[PDB]
């Protein structure tokens, strides 16, 4: 499989897992590059939507292929990334969900909750995530299309 | 605490859990009413984004307060609901995340994966979810505001 470009993002509550995941993934041949949008210290209290939207915008703008996002629960980063047009983001902490996030939902964003999941499970799931690639000709693509259809309702004016 | 109006939604892969959850919640004094947007049979192959967006639109339009959504993984329904302006949706399968979905993220939508979670855990989490109420004056409200700020970029033309 070809390697993918990743963005990674966290808030203050996700820093140590982010660092561990970044180290783990920097050795992986399915990762071509990692773009770290921060935060890079627990001292940085930047609110999670800013880091999530920045990382999601890198996907929309063709700079990366997927993003991995970490905060306390991984919920707010997923909500935030889903607000970006054409971006589909999940919070997932089990192997079946992570597979389906790609193969059913074509979700470019995977989010973890540092305060709820353990680091080895998170590393394992992130490694598995990279091995699935969405089939644009699948029956699932027609369901994803209904989401994209809804997104056509909106124009970005600001 | 005052009772809340709920919408409930599922696709074909979420029907039996939806029915069990609806039965469980119809006895709960924190639920004032349940609006079921379907599907109501495993024979109905309506794609999950339609049911999710319909249920999310009930919240946006002041018809219900929250929605519970069930499909195979609960991921696509969450993605879909997050596309609706002002709606914040999560997939959550643990007690800490469900609390924070409300108290941190002010998420009106909770989603479950029938194929990944068990029915008693799902019932328990849905009951707990109703007992938390977001504090609009909290520090978290300022973070949620950053999401709402981003949503201001878009106008709905169709
Ligand atoms: Cl948290
Ligand atoms: Cl797992
Ligand atoms: Cl599934
Ligand atoms: Cl739990």
Author numbering:
A (entry chain A), B (entry chain A): 6 to 163
Copy out sentences from the published article reporting this entry, exactly as the authors wrote them.
Ribose-5-phosphate isomerases catalyze the interconversion of ribulose-5-phosphate and ribose-5-phosphate as an important part of the pentose phosphate pathway. The C. immitis RpiB contains the canonical open (α,β) Rossman fold, a common fold for proteins that bind nucleotides or nucleotide-like molecules.
A 1.7 Å resolution structure was obtained in which the catalytic base of C. immitis RpiB, Cys76, appears to form a weakly covalent bond with the central carbon of malonic acid with a bond distance of 2.2 Å. The chemical reaction of Cys76 with iodoacetate is expected to form a Cys-CH2COOH adduct. The conformation of either of the carboxylates of malonic acid may be reflective of the carboxylate of the covalent adduct formed with iodoacetate. One of the carboxylates of malonic acid forms hydrogen bonds with the backbone amides of Thr78 (conserved as a serine or threonine, 3.0 Å) and the universally conserved Gly77 (2.9 Å) as well as the side chain of the universally conserved Asp16 (2.6 Å). The hydrogen bond with Asp16 is unlikely to occur at neutral pH where both carboxylates are expected to be deprotonated and negatively charged. In contrast, the interaction is well ordered in the pH 5.0 crystal. The second malonic acid carboxylate forms hydrogen bonding interactions with the backbone amide nitrogen of the universally conserved Gly81 (2.5 Å) and with the side chain of the universally conserved Asn110' of the other protomer of the obligate dimeric enzyme (3.0 Å). There is a chloride ion in the active site 3.7 Å away from the malonic acid and near Arg105' and Arg120, although this anion is ill-suited to mimic the iodide ion leaving group of iodoacetate because it is on the opposite side of the caboxylate relative to Cys76.
